[PDB]
Design a protein around this nucleic acid. Structure first.
Ligand code: B12
Ligand code: B12
Ligand code: B12
Ligand code: B12
Ligand SMILES: C[C@H]1O[C@@H](n2cnc3c(N)ncnc32)[C@H](O)[C@@H]1O
Ligand SMILES: C[C@H]1O[C@@H](n2cnc3c(N)ncnc32)[C@H](O)[C@@H]1O
Ligand SMILES: C[C@H]1O[C@@H](n2cnc3c(N)ncnc32)[C@H](O)[C@@H]1O
Ligand SMILES: C[C@H]1O[C@@H](n2cnc3c(N)ncnc32)[C@H](O)[C@@H]1O
Lengths: 279, 205, 276, 273
DNA sequence: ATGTACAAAAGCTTGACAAAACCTAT
DNA sequence: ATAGGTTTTGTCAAGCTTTTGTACAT
């Protein structure tokens, strides 16, 4: 019905699936599946989604299959929504690009184009940075993962429309080499029918102004992940780049935007709508 | 309005300079169809990139113009990379030396490897040597390939710096030479064609 | 109708010494108290305690049985209304976003039953009442079909002898067939969805050549079934299933097919052979 | 994914003893190994072995049957033949994989012209020649429609006055309409695809209420058009376009619609006049 | 009749073991 | 394709915690 993720007992499962309670605790120990929510006391609480899942595995085991592969073949097919983030990173860390690409496609179909970016692409990138920061992975491992995820995002960017009309130039301030933030901004713009020209990262301001003038660009959008590149810029440095200038990212703030002469934007969603309305 | 062969280079650049991504994409697909995958890289992708640098150098275009063109052409190459198969087995790690931010050279090397059935893992540019060695060890990588466009990042490296990265270490690009490769403890490779076959023949001969 | 603390004790079986603890531990039931303190259990609680007693005997625990029965609270019911309104004003972006919220909360199967199905039924009724035209319905139906096809592709497709899924000739409603194929795939069955309106000789020929284990037909209208002769479905495949609003047990027997009431027990039925 | 050597023996027909021998003298298949050395075959390998069993039964040796499958770099023109063959054997997984390959080579618009369209035409001709049945066409058409709808949803949907896209009443070929809608979306036009077979009064009423700027009709058959009276399409929307195999300039003039030859010039036509 | 206490029933974790299936090799 | 070594898997046991049915005292 309405709630797949619910609560059951280990006794109810033993009378619904046929598998004894002793087995259910062993498969959770050797494989991790199923992993039901636990009571404050310490007792299990299986969900309805897990109940129908185990009933399917019992068919394969009776048709000629081992529990080690019967579960693995199901975990790949009907994977948990939150296990995709963990799964994708693990696949990347072992150098399995094929497996990683496959897992991403599953996420794309579930969350949708915008959805997969917020709930899969973004959380993985954040965790990768933290994992590196904790010393769990090296720079080379991060590079592999970042290059892969960038390629997926670029694919979505190219799949979006590119309408005619005065372009919007999207890049990052000089000294800023994180480009994925800029790509996200460009993508959300294209999805709303704005001809966002993604330039790549690290663009000198005089050259950016010259290009905006020559192409008659309606706006310039800058993504700042680090704060130091912004602090290095003088007051009003962004004022005359284009008729409208926007600044966002983790490294950007409302106070800093006002000093540089740019409009601060909190979220990517409101950015496309802010182009239609006057400043 | 089909344009002539040598006019595709000129036309693609002009399309990019006017911000016509749609037109540029369409022109590239025509080139890919005419010359095939490897051919379109050599006759279209490479000449345009070289001219873009020269045009910037002469002051005909600014940095922002170059950025747009370079990002576009990188996206097309990454497409072909993903199009190629990725076989199982011990991977080959492909990147650039620390300080080297030109990555398109590395991508080309990784592409030609994949086309020959080699599981080339493209890491991206600018990878620290200790981390590279650690990754190569953990994944049991058969080889490491480095693309050097500038010479200064190589000159900054000490003697033998590349020797123990992986069982085999290859170095190439405009910034790399035979003399410099010997000093760093890497094997020099003149062209991308010979690189995939070099993985079958041991050392010298 | 309200009952005493001893009246419910006989209508359920549980003693009154337990009903007072369930109130002082879990919070159910919560009967009205007289000025003295006497407990008056409502009629909605008597039928509820009779349900838990059946669950507790099945092998459940009071803490879980009561919590499980608290699934009476209906899902975000404004999503059905909202999705339709979004579609009717031509806001595909807004509709897509609303559907994604429904999918994450109730999950894949859940969003079909509580969101996809109710909207489709209301759309037909709204058209029937003259509140919307055919063009409005078309937009909504095409959208919801696209979403379902997306989930279909998201499910895995296992190797082995395929199960062919379609609708009888003359039947153009295809969403019923898609739902059947989706539930099959979710259970590891290689359900090949053909689309609607497949001629019977061609269907039989395909089933034979692909060595299909079964054929599944969705019938929304009854007239396409009534147009078929007796035994028409008998030799299509080793097993033949028929369901939908237009199908019934009596009609299925005549055509030589097995009647299936719900999509849930369809996948379980294909595994183990059913009797006459 | 992950399978057992016992499952393969019951799915492919080849005994477990053979599967370990081909891994020893060819290297294929080379499945992921369990920590204890047990084999875990993937689904891609399962369908692969099922194909090799066909060639061995058709007259081929295992040494060449594997080598021809390993080094099968399919030509650009072999994709159309390959895709249809994959569909005809019921291999949706293989078909989907082949399509993504083509999407990456020709691009979004390219894959439709050189892969999606030629396969659909050949399917109709093959059916017409009696080489395939209706059921086989249905499978292929439903698959390709699903891929196109996926691309449609991946394109942007901008705000502003929508463009309604459908087919005339009696016309059940809808893929033509989807193509038109897709090309419009790729040019930043908010094309609302309605589906096929839409009554004219209802279409006019919807266009009016949503303030639609234009209506686009795809006609594959000519008979649905011939059944319409003169000027039937005139007042549907401020602009009305008509294209497809079943449509022509003479017939468009009679119905009061603008004839469009190619899908490429359709998006551009919506601005200049 | 409100409320606390007590004993039984059921769970959970660490640990181990015998059989079934499997891998490698001559 | 016969044979031996090895990994995987269903089952159970001891020690002990959480939970629930009954009851005990006011
Ligand atoms: C990949 C990566 C890199 C790659 C960049 C690859 C590339 N081509 O983009 C490389 C290897 C180059 C790199 C280098 C460095 N990085 Co780095 N990197 C990352 C990583 C893992 C992900 C970056 C990313 O793109 N994330 C995804 C973005 C989109 O997420 P987000 O910024 O939170 O974005 C959200 C909102 O801010 C909004 N937003 C973003 N952009 C925009 C734009 C607009 C207009 C709007 C409205 C909103 C908006 O959209 C998102 C909505 O959820 C992060 C980890 C992290 N926690 O972010 C570290 C991180 C950003 N890097 C970090 C560091 C330390 C560095 C280096 C200094 C390391 C070094 N010493 O070499 C260098 C700096 C190089 C330079 N000069 O810029 C630190 C930053 C610490 C700090 N802020 O002081 C981080 C946070 C890692 C950590 N320690 O946790 N990095
Ligand atoms: C795009 C670009 C950039 C982009 C890089 C984008 C990216 N993500 O890769 C950015 C903007 C970052 C950039 C920055 C700079 N660049 Co720059 N850039 C270029 C440009 C236009 C193309 C580079 C490219 O990839 N070309 C394509 C490669 C594949 O071609 P190729 O190297 O000739 O490769 C051939 C062979 O060498 C072989 N090969 C290549 N790799 C390998 C690998 C192996 C293993 C093998 C066997 C063979 C091999 O394959 C090819 C076969 O034809 C070039 C122009 C040019 N003439 O190359 C300038 C150029 C390389 N850059 C140049 C300069 C000056 C710079 C900067 C110093 C500018 C500055 N002051 O900021 C910085 C340096 C940054 C750094 N620290 O690395 C100069 C180099 C001058 C010099 N050598 O002294 C060039 C030559 C431009 C010019 N003046 O004509 N650059
Ligand atoms: C969308 C739609 C259409 C679309 C179809 C789009 C498509 N490609 O599928 C189009 C526009 C083509 C259409 C046409 C017609 N339709 Co219509 N349509 C609908 C609508 C709104 C939804 C149909 C749908 O798919 N619903 C979702 C299905 C899945 O729901 P369900 O059948 O109740 O399914 C449940 C169970 O039965 C079970 N089940 C379903 N399939 C299966 C299969 C198996 C194996 C099993 C075990 C169980 C099972 O699963 C579900 C669990 O909740 C319905 C409204 C409605 N009340 O259903 C009208 C409706 C079905 N249509 C109706 C009518 C009148 C018609 C037309 C005759 C109108 C006309 N004159 O042109 C034509 C007939 C065309 C034809 N020859 O088939 C009437 C039917 C009246 C009747 N039964 O006598 C309905 C009921 C509308 C109404 N008046 O309320 N229709
Ligand atoms: C799939 C299919 C079906 C499916 C439809 C599925 C669906 N939901 O769309 C079904 C099974 C329903 C079907 C039924 C029928 N079909 Co049929 N079908 C086909 C098939 C194989 C492909 C159709 C298709 O979409 N092709 C792709 C389209 C996009 O290609 P295209 O029209 O050439 O389009 C190009 C240009 O015209 C342009 N264009 C198209 N639309 C538009 C729109 C605009 C605005 C513009 C500017 C341009 C434009 O874009 C393309 C650029 O290359 C064709 C084969 C074929 N040769 O087309 C037969 C075909 C169209 N069908 C045919 C027949 C005979 C029928 C039936 C009469 C069979 C029957 N007796 O039941 C019925 C008619 C049903 C009806 N009332 O409409 C014949 C038509 C013969 C004729 N013209 O006289 C064909 C040609 C098969 C053959 N014999 O070769 N069909
Ligand atoms: C933000 C990311 O920057 C990368 N990183 C850290 N130091 C360097 C360096 N010297 N060169 C290149 N990348 C680096 C790490 O992998 C980290 O995840
Ligand atoms: C090699 C390429 O480097 C680019 N380039 C030159 N100077 C800078 C800079 N400060 N920042 C970023 N890119 C730069 C030019 O566009 C040239 O084409
Ligand atoms: C069941 C659905 O059929 C649609 N419907 C009703 N009449 C027609 C017709 N002539 N053509 C197409 N669709 C029609 C209505 O929109 C209804 O909702
Ligand atoms: C144009 C397509 O129409 C299909 N086709 C032909 N006759 C019928 C029918 N009676 N019902 C459904 N589809 C049919 C064929 O499969 C052909 O390929």
């Amino acid at each position: 019905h309405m709630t797949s993720s619910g609560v059951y007992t280990i006794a109810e499962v033993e009378a619904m699936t046929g598998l004894s309670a002793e087995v259910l605790r062993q498969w959770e120990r050797r494989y991790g599946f199923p992993k039901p929510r636990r009571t404050p006391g310490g007792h299990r609480l299986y969900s309805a989604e897990d109940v129908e899942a185990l009933k399917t595995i019992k068919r394969w085991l009776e048709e000629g299959a081992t529990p080690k592969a019967a579960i693995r073949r199901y975990l790949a097919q009907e994977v948990r929504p939150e296990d995709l983030g963990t799964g994708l990173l693990e696949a990347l860390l072992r150098g399995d690009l094929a497996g990683a690409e496959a897992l991403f496609r599953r996420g794309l179909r579930f969350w949708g184009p915008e959805g997969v970016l917020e709930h899969l692409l973004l959380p993985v990138l954040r965790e990768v940075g933290e994992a590196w920061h904790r010393g769990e992975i090296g720079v080379a491992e991060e590079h592999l993962a970042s290059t892969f995820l960038r390629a997926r995002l670029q694919e979505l960017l190219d799949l979006a429309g590119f309408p005619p009309g005065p372009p919007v130039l999207v890049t990052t301030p000089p000294g800023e080499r994180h480009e994925i933030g800029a790509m996200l901004a460009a993508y959300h713009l294209r999805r709303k029918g704005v001809p966002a020209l993604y330039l790549g990262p690290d663009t000198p301001l005089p050259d950016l102004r010259a290009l905006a003038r020559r192409l008659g660009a309606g706006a310039v959008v800058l993504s700042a992940v680090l704060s130091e590149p912004l602090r290095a810029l003088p007051d009003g440095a962004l004022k005359d780049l284009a008729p409208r200038v926007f600044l966002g990212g983790q490294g950007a703030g409302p106070e800093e935007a006002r000093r540089l002469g740019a409009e601060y934007m909190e979220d990517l969603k409101g950015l496309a709508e802010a182009l239609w309305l006057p400043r | 309005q089909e344009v002539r062969p040598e006019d595709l280079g000129t036309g693609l650049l002009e399309a990019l300079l006017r911000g016509d991504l749609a037109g540029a994409e369409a022109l590239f697909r025509r080139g890919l169809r005419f010359w095939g995958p490897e051919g379109v890289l050599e006759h279209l992708l490479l000449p345009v990139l070289r001219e873009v640098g020269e045009a910037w150098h002469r002051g005909e275009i600014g940095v922002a113009e170059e950025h747009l063109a370079s990002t576009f052409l990188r996206a097309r190459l990454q497409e072909l990379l993903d199009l190629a198969g990725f076989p199982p087995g011990p991977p080959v790690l492909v990147t650039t030396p620390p300080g080297e931010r030109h990555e398109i050279g590395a991508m080309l090397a990784a592409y030609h490897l994949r086309r020959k059935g080699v599981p080339a893992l493209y890491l991206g540019p600018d990878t620290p040597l200790p981390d590279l060695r650690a990754l190569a060890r953990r994944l049991g990588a058969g080889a490491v390939v480095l693309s050097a466009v500038l010479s200064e990042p190589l000159r900054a490296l000490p003697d033998g710096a590349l020797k123990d990265l992986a069982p085999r270490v290859f170095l190439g690009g405009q910034g790399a030479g035979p003399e410099e490769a010997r000093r760093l403890g890497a094997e020099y490779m003149e062209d991308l064609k010979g690189l995939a076959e070099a993985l079958w023949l041991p050392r010298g001969p």
